[PDB]
Write a protein that binds this ligand. Structure first.
Ligand SMILES: O=C(O)[C@H]1O[C@@H](O[C@H]2[C@H](O)[C@H](O)[C@H](O[C@H]3[C@H](O)[C@H](O)[C@@H](O)O[C@@H]3C(=O)O)O[C@@H]2C(=O)O)[C@@H](O)[C@@H](O)[C@@H]1O
Ligand SMILES: O=C(O)[C@H]1O[C@@H](O[C@H]2[C@H](O)[C@H](O)[C@H](O[C@H]3[C@H](O)[C@H](O)[C@H](O)O[C@@H]3C(=O)O)O[C@H]2C(=O)O)[C@@H](O)[C@@H](O)[C@@H]1O
Ligand code: CL
Length: 230
């Protein structure tokens, strides 16, 4: 039988501050249900250690969405509220099966748009450089569709072993740290000033596959939203 993520202590803090959305943004499990042992092939404990997310289908997801702690409702914060908002993770990204092209593994999202997606990418050229099998950040600096609305950055080549990530937002600036090294330093988020509906997400969100049957799979060794106010 499939072992539940809540059967160990590692993820209890974030599970107390998240709902699970699967296979769309519809609710799969409340925070209470997650802490109570919700489990399925889409969301189970792998190797006695990893919170594993799986999903197939274009734009489908198996993803945690930040909630107010202790059974609270959906959280919303602003990039310019003066507080540091922080998400940390340690992720084992396995080799992805054929047909999977991009898997978003962490986000800052609002009621209308993704401010930031950290994603695994099979193959893409950025600023005239081709990259394969890598982790990318995609930041929106507008709501348009043209390339001027995005800043897309190679963060790191995918590693077989766990890779640590940290996202920090303070005073309308974004920092991304990968394996302890700052890769994105003070990216401007001021376009989003006054948007009070931002929140963190993490898991597996499957983007532009070439087969809707192909199952994305992502293993978290750690995940937390870090409250700077205690
Ligand atoms: O390699 C490129 O730059 C391609 O970008 C394509 O447009 C992207 C866009 O830059 C961005 O990555 C966007 O991300 C969306 C995501 O896939 C999900 O649909 C959801 O999270 O919404 C995101 C968003 O709207 O920000 O996806 C589009 C896309 O539809 O592919 C094209 O411009 C492409 O021609 C170009 O090669
Ligand atoms: O296009 C998407 O799939 C986006 O969905 C986002 O989640 C929303 C979405 O509305 C979703 O259906 C669900 O809505 C809930 C929620 O309670 C909301 O407040 C609404 O008023 O009632 C719905 C309910 O009771 O089930 O959750 C929403 C949310 O913000 O969490 C995100 O998953 C986006 O990332 C996504 O692009
Ligand atoms: Cl992208």
């Amino acid at each position: 039988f499939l072992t539940a993520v809540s059967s160990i202590d590692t993820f209890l803090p974030v599970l107390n501050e998240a709902k699970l959305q699967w296979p769309t943004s519809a609710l799969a499990a409340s925070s209470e249900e997650l802490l109570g042992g919700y489990v399925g092939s889409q969301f189970y404990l792998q190797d006695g250690k990893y919170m594993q997310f799986q999903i197939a289908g274009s734009s489908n997801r198996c993803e945690l969405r930040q909630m107010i702690p202790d059974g609270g409702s959906e959280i919303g914060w602003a990039v310019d509220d003066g507080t540091t908002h922080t998400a940390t993770s340690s992720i084992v990204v396995p080799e992805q099966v054929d047909g999977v092209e991009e898997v978003t593994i962490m986000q800052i999202h609002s009621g209308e748009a993704p401010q930031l997606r950290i994603s695994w990418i099979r193959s893409k050229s950025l600023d005239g450089v081709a990259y394969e099998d890598f982790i990318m950040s995609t930041v929106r600096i507008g709501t348009g569709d043209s390339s001027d609305n995005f800043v897309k950055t190679h963060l790191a080549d995918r590693t077989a072993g766990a890779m640590s990530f940290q996202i920090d937002v303070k005073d309308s600036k974004l920092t991304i740290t990968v394996n302890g090294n700052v890769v994105v330093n003070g990216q401007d988020l001021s376009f989003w000033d006054g948007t009070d509906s931002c929140y963190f997400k993490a898991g597996a969100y499957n983007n532009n596959p070439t087969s809707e049957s192909a199952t994305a799979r992502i293993k978290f060794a750690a995940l937390a939203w870090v409250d700077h106010h205690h």
